[PDB]
Amino acid sequence: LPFDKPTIM
Amino acid sequence: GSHSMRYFYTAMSRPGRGEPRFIAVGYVDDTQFVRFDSDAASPRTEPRAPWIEQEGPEYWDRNTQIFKTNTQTYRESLRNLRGYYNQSEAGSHIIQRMYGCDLGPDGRLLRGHDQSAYDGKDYIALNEDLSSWTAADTAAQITQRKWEAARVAEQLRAYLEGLCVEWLRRYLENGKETLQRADPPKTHVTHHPVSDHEATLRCWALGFYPAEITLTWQRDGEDQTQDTELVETRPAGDRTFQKWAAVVVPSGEEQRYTCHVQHEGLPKPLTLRWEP
Amino acid sequence: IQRTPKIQVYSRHPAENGKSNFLNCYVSGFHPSDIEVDLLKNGERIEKVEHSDLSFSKDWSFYLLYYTEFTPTEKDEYACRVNHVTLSQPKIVKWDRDM
Ligand code: NA
Ligand code: NA
């Protein structure tokens, strides 16, 4: 299952 | 044995050819089990291994929501990084991300990973402590400040030590007949005269899983590293892999050469010679 | 900074003339990801070719597998034609059942 939180760079 | 789970993301801009493409693939060891492609006619998370098919609609919806959100996040990140490197709006650029967890033979967390690259160069990586970041340059330092404010490392540590290991253990159980089965290589040595003075000995390894293997040639018991032609391990298309190693030997000296094979599917490493 | 593709052309199963097999063209170690890959039969493009989903290695270079069903023979010539931004002209790599 993938990571569910956004990571805007 | 030891097992890992990884997600691989690729976000590619293409100015004048629409919005950036986002693709995500998921692996357990060397087995792909999911894909998501924002360019697909109707983008959805799709199964790519039979053992993932038993997952219910809530699983497929949840994955799709995450990857659709990632598609938008990565388009913003591509804009941001173009800005950080003062690049023109004309060029195509790529962000890649790879993350996941490694388990030991006991099934315990060995370590977590979360690494990102920009145009194929390391950009930012989560340190092995799962608490701090390694930024490659002053541009990656800007991402680092943002990620510190959003508590990203703390969120990743929770995921990597939690849901990542949990779902990996679930997949390993559901796909135990394949994922927990090591297929040893089928090995043989071929001989190809290249002249009257020399011949090529090629040591083959076929049908093995997982992809990790060691193929070496020895001459009178010593490694021929500099004189061995080693091809990259390659997929057969049926889950297994193939590899070969070759040495050019003087005619009549063939029996002084031995091929050595190490693979998880092999109790003990193998020793082969050309059998005329 | 770009990386040119490594190309391997080979069969899934050991090649036996007149026996159905799969012809593979594995492209790897390249960057950026756009790539053109064609499987050729006597210099002619094979129309029904499938490929794997885009993924990459620990060094960030991409890799893809292009494959099709084929029945090898003594007279037919197979190859893989690849083009990438790093190549001035497409690279043709012939299938050698000893490689
Ligand atoms: Na898209
Ligand atoms: Na080109």
Tab-separated table of C-alpha atoms and ligand atoms in Angstrom:
chain	number	residue	atom	x	y	z
A	1	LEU	CA	0.000	0.000	0.000
A	2	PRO	CA	1.513	3.439	-0.908
A	3	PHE	CA	2.219	6.412	1.404
A	4	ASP	CA	-0.945	8.589	1.622
A	5	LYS	CA	0.291	12.126	2.496
A	6	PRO	CA	1.224	14.819	-0.079
A	7	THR	CA	4.884	15.793	-0.382
A	8	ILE	CA	4.882	19.080	-2.501
A	9	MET	CA	8.593	19.851	-3.104
B	1	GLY	CA	14.485	-14.990	3.264
B	2	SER	CA	14.836	-11.165	3.183
B	3	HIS	CA	12.074	-9.191	1.481
B	4	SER	CA	11.377	-5.629	0.398
B	5	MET	CA	8.555	-3.446	-0.883
B	6	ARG	CA	9.109	-0.443	-3.096
B	7	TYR	CA	7.127	2.161	-4.931
B	8	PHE	CA	8.732	3.852	-7.922
B	9	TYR	CA	7.283	7.173	-9.098
B	10	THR	CA	8.219	9.001	-12.317
B	11	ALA	CA	6.867	12.544	-13.096
B	12	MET	CA	7.868	13.900	-16.476
B	13	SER	CA	7.138	17.403	-17.809
B	14	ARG	CA	6.670	17.890	-21.598
B	15	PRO	CA	6.120	21.612	-22.392
B	16	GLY	CA	3.812	22.127	-25.361
B	17	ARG	CA	2.624	18.480	-25.058
B	18	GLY	CA	0.177	18.725	-22.179
B	19	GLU	CA	0.513	18.362	-18.455
B	20	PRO	CA	3.285	16.211	-16.862
B	21	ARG	CA	2.801	12.453	-16.894
B	22	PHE	CA	2.829	10.660	-13.521
B	23	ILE	CA	3.490	6.894	-13.373
B	24	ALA	CA	3.717	4.792	-10.239
B	25	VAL	CA	4.670	1.102	-10.024
B	26	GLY	CA	4.784	-1.063	-6.913
B	27	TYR	CA	7.133	-4.006	-6.308
B	28	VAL	CA	7.618	-6.791	-3.760
B	29	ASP	CA	11.280	-7.821	-4.354
B	30	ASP	CA	11.540	-8.276	-8.163
B	31	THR	CA	7.787	-8.719	-8.714
B	32	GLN	CA	5.683	-5.809	-9.902
B	33	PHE	CA	2.189	-5.935	-8.435
B	34	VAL	CA	0.522	-2.544	-9.274
B	35	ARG	CA	0.659	0.273	-11.816
B	36	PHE	CA	-0.908	3.709	-12.149
B	37	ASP	CA	-0.440	5.891	-15.241
B	38	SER	CA	-1.978	9.386	-15.532
B	39	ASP	CA	-1.855	9.043	-19.383
B	40	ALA	CA	-4.075	5.906	-19.440
B	41	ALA	CA	-7.493	6.340	-21.161
B	42	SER	CA	-9.197	6.163	-17.688
B	43	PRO	CA	-6.449	6.334	-14.993
B	44	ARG	CA	-6.864	3.773	-12.246
B	45	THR	CA	-4.605	1.588	-10.141
B	46	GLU	CA	-4.329	-1.754	-11.948
B	47	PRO	CA	-3.207	-5.181	-10.677
B	48	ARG	CA	-0.009	-6.608	-12.178
B	49	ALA	CA	0.406	-9.811	-10.083
B	50	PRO	CA	-2.379	-12.446	-9.521
B	51	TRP	CA	-2.050	-12.406	-5.683
B	52	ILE	CA	-3.030	-8.693	-5.518
B	53	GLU	CA	-6.363	-9.371	-7.371
B	54	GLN	CA	-8.087	-10.668	-4.120
B	55	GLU	CA	-7.835	-7.095	-2.726
B	56	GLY	CA	-11.291	-5.499	-2.605
B	57	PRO	CA	-12.725	-2.339	-4.233
B	58	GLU	CA	-11.823	-0.196	-1.153
B	59	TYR	CA	-8.118	-1.083	-1.766
B	60	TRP	CA	-8.269	-0.110	-5.503
B	61	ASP	CA	-10.205	3.119	-4.733
B	62	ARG	CA	-7.768	4.092	-1.960
B	63	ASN	CA	-4.683	3.511	-4.223
B	64	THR	CA	-6.292	5.459	-7.085
B	65	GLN	CA	-7.158	8.437	-4.799
B	66	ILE	CA	-3.494	8.506	-3.585
B	67	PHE	CA	-2.000	8.327	-7.096
B	68	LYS	CA	-4.467	10.902	-8.485
B	69	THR	CA	-3.427	13.235	-5.614
B	70	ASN	CA	0.255	12.454	-6.405
B	71	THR	CA	-0.338	13.351	-10.088
B	72	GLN	CA	-1.353	16.899	-8.982
B	73	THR	CA	1.355	17.212	-6.255
B	74	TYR	CA	4.108	16.192	-8.691
B	75	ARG	CA	2.968	18.722	-11.335
B	76	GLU	CA	3.345	21.427	-8.658
B	77	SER	CA	6.747	20.006	-7.603
B	78	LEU	CA	7.942	20.044	-11.256
B	79	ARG	CA	6.948	23.796	-11.482
B	80	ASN	CA	8.729	24.480	-8.160
B	81	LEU	CA	11.975	22.706	-9.092
B	82	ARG	CA	12.065	24.417	-12.500
B	83	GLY	CA	11.965	27.665	-10.448
B	84	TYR	CA	14.640	26.506	-7.965
B	85	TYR	CA	17.141	25.819	-10.783
B	86	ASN	CA	16.095	28.973	-12.734
B	87	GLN	CA	15.342	26.791	-15.724
B	88	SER	CA	13.425	27.879	-18.792
B	89	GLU	CA	9.779	26.828	-19.380
B	90	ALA	CA	11.032	25.133	-22.675
B	91	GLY	CA	12.774	21.995	-21.336
B	92	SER	CA	11.403	18.639	-20.167
B	93	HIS	CA	12.366	17.570	-16.678
B	94	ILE	CA	11.845	14.516	-14.534
B	95	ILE	CA	11.310	13.911	-10.829
B	96	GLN	CA	11.719	10.343	-9.594
B	97	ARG	CA	10.973	8.915	-6.187
B	98	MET	CA	11.639	5.499	-4.699
B	99	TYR	CA	10.558	4.496	-1.202
B	100	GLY	CA	9.752	1.422	0.814
B	101	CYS	CA	10.760	-0.944	3.513
B	102	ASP	CA	13.234	-3.841	3.895
B	103	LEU	CA	12.530	-6.862	6.098
B	104	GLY	CA	15.088	-9.318	7.432
B	105	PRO	CA	14.725	-13.163	7.362
B	106	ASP	CA	12.744	-12.973	10.670
B	107	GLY	CA	10.312	-10.564	8.982
B	108	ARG	CA	11.468	-7.619	11.149
B	109	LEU	CA	12.096	-4.092	9.722
B	110	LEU	CA	15.717	-3.872	8.622
B	111	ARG	CA	15.458	-0.264	7.329
B	112	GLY	CA	13.255	2.229	5.497
B	113	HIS	CA	13.971	4.290	2.353
B	114	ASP	CA	12.626	7.460	0.734
B	115	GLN	CA	14.754	9.035	-2.012
B	116	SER	CA	14.050	11.602	-4.726
B	117	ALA	CA	15.969	12.635	-7.865
B	118	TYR	CA	15.711	15.480	-10.361
B	119	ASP	CA	16.817	14.848	-13.974
B	120	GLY	CA	18.450	11.583	-12.774
B	121	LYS	CA	20.619	13.219	-10.079
B	122	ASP	CA	20.094	12.671	-6.339
B	123	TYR	CA	18.018	15.573	-4.970
B	124	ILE	CA	16.770	14.761	-1.440
B	125	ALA	CA	16.824	11.580	0.644
B	126	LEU	CA	15.427	10.495	4.001
B	127	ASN	CA	18.368	9.421	6.207
B	128	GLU	CA	18.467	5.865	7.663
B	129	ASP	CA	17.338	7.358	11.059
B	130	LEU	CA	13.931	8.183	9.319
B	131	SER	CA	14.107	11.585	11.072
B	132	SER	CA	16.492	13.779	9.056
B	133	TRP	CA	17.190	14.666	5.362
B	134	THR	CA	20.228	14.796	3.089
B	135	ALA	CA	19.693	17.721	0.544
B	136	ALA	CA	21.974	17.582	-2.497
B	137	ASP	CA	22.161	21.391	-3.098
B	138	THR	CA	20.626	24.809	-2.200
B	139	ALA	CA	17.542	23.954	-4.298
B	140	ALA	CA	16.967	20.702	-2.377
B	141	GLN	CA	17.458	22.736	0.855
B	142	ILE	CA	14.251	24.651	-0.052
B	143	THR	CA	12.318	21.299	-0.245
B	144	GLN	CA	13.941	20.288	3.084
B	145	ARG	CA	12.457	23.411	4.905
B	146	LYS	CA	9.020	22.721	3.435
B	147	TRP	CA	9.171	19.068	4.501
B	148	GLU	CA	10.332	19.962	8.000
B	149	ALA	CA	7.241	22.289	8.421
B	150	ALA	CA	4.807	19.601	7.185
B	151	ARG	CA	6.379	16.986	9.599
B	152	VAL	CA	7.071	14.809	6.487
B	153	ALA	CA	9.929	12.682	8.029
B	154	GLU	CA	7.702	11.899	11.049
B	155	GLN	CA	4.861	10.878	8.678
B	156	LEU	CA	7.274	8.704	6.626
B	157	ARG	CA	8.732	7.047	9.735
B	158	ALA	CA	5.166	6.141	10.894
B	159	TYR	CA	4.368	4.720	7.433
B	160	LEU	CA	7.701	2.865	6.937
B	161	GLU	CA	7.625	1.236	10.371
B	162	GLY	CA	3.844	0.715	10.268
B	163	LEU	CA	1.639	0.322	7.190
B	164	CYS	CA	4.622	-0.429	4.887
B	165	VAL	CA	5.797	-3.481	6.886
B	166	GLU	CA	2.175	-4.555	7.588
B	167	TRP	CA	1.114	-4.556	3.932
B	168	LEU	CA	4.402	-6.126	2.826
B	169	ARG	CA	3.834	-9.019	5.285
B	170	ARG	CA	0.236	-9.377	3.942
B	171	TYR	CA	1.444	-9.529	0.321
B	172	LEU	CA	4.155	-12.049	1.218
B	173	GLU	CA	1.475	-14.305	2.774
B	174	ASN	CA	-1.061	-13.899	-0.100
B	175	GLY	CA	1.645	-14.523	-2.712
B	176	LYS	CA	3.695	-17.005	-0.642
B	177	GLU	CA	3.750	-19.657	-3.449
B	178	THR	CA	5.753	-17.274	-5.706
B	179	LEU	CA	7.125	-14.424	-3.559
B	180	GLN	CA	8.622	-16.824	-0.978
B	181	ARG	CA	9.880	-19.286	-3.589
B	182	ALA	CA	13.452	-18.919	-4.851
B	183	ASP	CA	14.000	-20.474	-8.304
B	184	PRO	CA	17.614	-21.556	-8.731
B	185	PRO	CA	19.378	-20.821	-12.029
B	186	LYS	CA	19.680	-23.495	-14.713
B	187	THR	CA	23.389	-23.350	-15.597
B	188	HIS	CA	25.612	-24.438	-18.525
B	189	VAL	CA	28.865	-23.481	-20.277
B	190	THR	CA	29.080	-22.909	-24.023
B	191	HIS	CA	32.258	-22.799	-26.139
B	192	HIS	CA	32.728	-20.550	-29.189
B	193	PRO	CA	36.127	-20.610	-31.054
B	194	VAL	CA	37.020	-16.953	-31.879
B	195	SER	CA	40.325	-17.870	-33.708
B	196	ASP	CA	42.873	-20.772	-33.876
B	197	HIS	CA	44.580	-19.285	-30.756
B	198	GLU	CA	41.505	-18.398	-28.573
B	199	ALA	CA	37.892	-19.391	-27.713
B	200	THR	CA	35.078	-17.843	-25.679
B	201	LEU	CA	33.699	-19.718	-22.694
B	202	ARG	CA	30.233	-18.404	-21.772
B	203	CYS	CA	28.678	-19.335	-18.486
B	204	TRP	CA	24.870	-19.095	-18.536
B	205	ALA	CA	22.336	-18.724	-15.719
B	206	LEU	CA	18.654	-19.007	-16.757
B	207	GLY	CA	15.256	-19.156	-15.100
B	208	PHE	CA	16.219	-17.785	-11.712
B	209	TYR	CA	14.269	-15.701	-9.160
B	210	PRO	CA	14.974	-13.307	-7.460
B	211	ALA	CA	17.253	-11.317	-9.809
B	212	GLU	CA	20.208	-11.135	-7.328
B	213	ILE	CA	22.989	-13.521	-8.525
B	214	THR	CA	26.795	-13.737	-8.614
B	215	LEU	CA	28.423	-15.205	-11.806
B	216	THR	CA	32.207	-15.234	-11.903
B	217	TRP	CA	35.029	-16.886	-13.898
B	218	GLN	CA	38.206	-18.120	-12.264
B	219	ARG	CA	41.506	-19.130	-13.940
B	220	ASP	CA	43.503	-21.610	-11.748
B	221	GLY	CA	41.304	-20.573	-8.765
B	222	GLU	CA	41.738	-16.777	-9.128
B	223	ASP	CA	38.990	-14.270	-10.219
B	224	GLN	CA	39.159	-12.947	-13.803
B	225	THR	CA	37.213	-9.697	-12.984
B	226	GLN	CA	39.015	-7.464	-15.540
B	227	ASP	CA	38.792	-10.090	-18.371
B	228	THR	CA	35.156	-11.182	-17.784
B	229	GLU	CA	32.375	-9.781	-20.021
B	230	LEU	CA	29.335	-9.664	-17.715
B	231	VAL	CA	25.947	-8.772	-19.198
B	232	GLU	CA	23.322	-6.992	-17.148
B	233	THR	CA	20.811	-9.364	-15.472
B	234	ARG	CA	17.787	-9.347	-17.779
B	235	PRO	CA	14.104	-10.374	-17.355
B	236	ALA	CA	12.822	-13.406	-19.256
B	237	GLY	CA	9.250	-12.001	-19.272
B	238	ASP	CA	7.871	-14.937	-17.192
B	239	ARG	CA	9.023	-13.608	-13.699
B	240	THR	CA	12.518	-15.157	-14.025
B	241	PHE	CA	15.854	-13.621	-14.967
B	242	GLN	CA	18.878	-14.479	-17.080
B	243	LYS	CA	22.555	-13.635	-17.031
B	244	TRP	CA	25.808	-14.750	-18.625
B	245	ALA	CA	29.548	-14.189	-18.062
B	246	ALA	CA	32.160	-14.766	-20.724
B	247	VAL	CA	35.954	-15.144	-20.856
B	248	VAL	CA	38.241	-15.386	-23.907
B	249	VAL	CA	40.631	-18.229	-23.173
B	250	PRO	CA	43.724	-19.630	-25.028
B	251	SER	CA	42.948	-22.814	-27.058
B	252	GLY	CA	43.720	-25.930	-24.993
B	253	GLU	CA	43.585	-24.079	-21.607
B	254	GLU	CA	39.750	-24.431	-21.213
B	255	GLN	CA	39.947	-26.817	-18.205
B	256	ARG	CA	41.903	-24.198	-16.171
B	257	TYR	CA	38.688	-22.096	-16.091
B	258	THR	CA	35.808	-22.495	-13.684
B	259	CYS	CA	32.481	-20.675	-13.541
B	260	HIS	CA	31.107	-19.969	-10.036
B	261	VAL	CA	27.403	-19.367	-9.396
B	262	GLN	CA	25.813	-18.056	-6.173
B	263	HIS	CA	22.028	-17.636	-5.840
B	264	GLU	CA	19.486	-17.746	-2.950
B	265	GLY	CA	17.871	-20.741	-4.699
B	266	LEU	CA	21.248	-22.597	-4.304
B	267	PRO	CA	22.114	-24.167	-0.934
B	268	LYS	CA	25.738	-24.145	-1.908
B	269	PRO	CA	27.521	-22.150	-4.573
B	270	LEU	CA	28.006	-24.069	-7.897
B	271	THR	CA	31.250	-24.729	-9.839
B	272	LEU	CA	31.031	-25.392	-13.631
B	273	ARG	CA	33.489	-26.154	-16.411
B	274	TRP	CA	33.153	-26.553	-20.147
B	275	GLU	CA	32.076	-30.155	-20.807
B	276	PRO	CA	33.335	-31.131	-24.327
C	1	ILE	CA	23.341	15.031	-18.369
C	2	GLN	CA	21.848	12.103	-20.303
C	3	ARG	CA	22.510	8.334	-20.396
C	4	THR	CA	22.392	6.157	-23.481
C	5	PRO	CA	20.480	2.849	-23.448
C	6	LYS	CA	22.091	-0.561	-23.069
C	7	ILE	CA	20.312	-3.028	-25.390
C	8	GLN	CA	19.975	-6.820	-25.188
C	9	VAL	CA	18.064	-8.939	-27.718
C	10	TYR	CA	17.302	-12.492	-26.671
C	11	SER	CA	14.702	-15.177	-26.312
C	12	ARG	CA	12.647	-16.077	-23.203
C	13	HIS	CA	13.286	-19.802	-23.635
C	14	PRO	CA	16.299	-21.534	-25.304
C	15	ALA	CA	15.932	-21.082	-29.094
C	16	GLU	CA	14.775	-24.183	-30.996
C	17	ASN	CA	13.982	-23.659	-34.737
C	18	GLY	CA	10.281	-24.162	-35.526
C	19	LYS	CA	9.255	-23.897	-31.810
C	20	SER	CA	7.184	-20.873	-30.577
C	21	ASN	CA	9.069	-18.629	-28.145
C	22	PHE	CA	9.206	-14.950	-27.102
C	23	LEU	CA	11.601	-12.371	-28.598
C	24	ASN	CA	12.793	-9.827	-26.040
C	25	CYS	CA	14.460	-6.492	-26.323
C	26	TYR	CA	15.584	-5.192	-22.961
C	27	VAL	CA	16.578	-1.537	-22.890
C	28	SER	CA	18.117	-0.274	-19.687
C	29	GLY	CA	20.474	2.291	-18.117
C	30	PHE	CA	18.978	5.252	-20.013
C	31	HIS	CA	17.915	8.741	-19.034
C	32	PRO	CA	15.610	10.566	-19.809
C	33	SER	CA	12.751	8.045	-20.144
C	34	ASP	CA	11.397	8.707	-23.687
C	35	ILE	CA	12.557	5.878	-25.946
C	36	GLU	CA	11.463	4.292	-29.262
C	37	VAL	CA	11.751	0.544	-29.481
C	38	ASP	CA	10.809	-1.644	-32.437
C	39	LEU	CA	11.241	-5.415	-32.863
C	40	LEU	CA	12.203	-6.269	-36.484
C	41	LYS	CA	11.688	-9.438	-38.575
C	42	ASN	CA	13.964	-9.302	-41.711
C	43	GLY	CA	14.255	-5.508	-41.280
C	44	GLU	CA	10.417	-5.092	-41.038
C	45	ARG	CA	8.650	-3.721	-37.895
C	46	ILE	CA	6.659	-6.324	-35.957
C	47	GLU	CA	3.268	-4.766	-35.425
C	48	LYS	CA	2.084	-6.578	-32.258
C	49	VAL	CA	4.725	-5.746	-29.566
C	50	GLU	CA	3.957	-5.382	-25.807
C	51	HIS	CA	6.104	-3.700	-23.166
C	52	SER	CA	6.575	-3.515	-19.400
C	53	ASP	CA	5.578	-0.534	-17.228
C	54	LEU	CA	8.186	2.198	-16.821
C	55	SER	CA	10.415	1.600	-13.816
C	56	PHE	CA	13.971	2.417	-12.855
C	57	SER	CA	17.118	1.105	-11.138
C	58	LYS	CA	18.854	2.245	-7.888
C	59	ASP	CA	21.053	4.652	-10.019
C	60	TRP	CA	17.751	6.266	-11.388
C	61	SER	CA	18.272	4.916	-14.923
C	62	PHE	CA	15.148	3.593	-16.640
C	63	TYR	CA	14.517	0.134	-17.989
C	64	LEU	CA	11.873	-1.475	-20.209
C	65	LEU	CA	11.192	-4.887	-21.721
C	66	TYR	CA	9.638	-5.071	-25.244
C	67	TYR	CA	8.449	-8.528	-26.224
C	68	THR	CA	6.487	-10.517	-28.791
C	69	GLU	CA	5.742	-14.164	-29.644
C	70	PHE	CA	8.060	-15.480	-32.453
C	71	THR	CA	8.948	-18.865	-33.951
C	72	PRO	CA	12.694	-18.758	-34.731
C	73	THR	CA	14.013	-20.372	-37.962
C	74	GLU	CA	17.430	-20.917	-39.613
C	75	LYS	CA	16.782	-18.198	-42.274
C	76	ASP	CA	14.777	-15.448	-40.462
C	77	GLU	CA	16.729	-12.463	-39.067
C	78	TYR	CA	15.483	-10.726	-35.893
C	79	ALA	CA	16.577	-7.477	-34.367
C	80	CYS	CA	15.755	-4.579	-32.096
C	81	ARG	CA	15.813	-0.961	-33.344
C	82	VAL	CA	16.173	1.667	-30.628
C	83	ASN	CA	16.158	5.434	-30.743
C	84	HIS	CA	16.822	7.819	-27.826
C	85	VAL	CA	17.770	11.497	-27.478
C	86	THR	CA	21.416	10.341	-26.878
C	87	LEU	CA	21.551	8.570	-30.313
C	88	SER	CA	22.056	10.556	-33.562
C	89	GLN	CA	20.583	7.631	-35.524
C	90	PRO	CA	18.549	4.514	-34.424
C	91	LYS	CA	20.676	1.621	-33.105
C	92	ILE	CA	19.952	-1.808	-34.548
C	93	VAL	CA	21.037	-4.808	-32.445
C	94	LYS	CA	20.625	-8.196	-34.125
C	95	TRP	CA	19.354	-11.255	-32.305
C	96	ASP	CA	22.149	-13.771	-31.710
C	97	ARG	CA	20.843	-16.961	-30.020
C	98	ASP	CA	24.399	-17.344	-28.473
C	99	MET	CA	23.984	-13.990	-26.634
D	1	NA	NA	-0.834	12.605	-17.792
D	2	NA	NA	17.880	10.175	-31.450
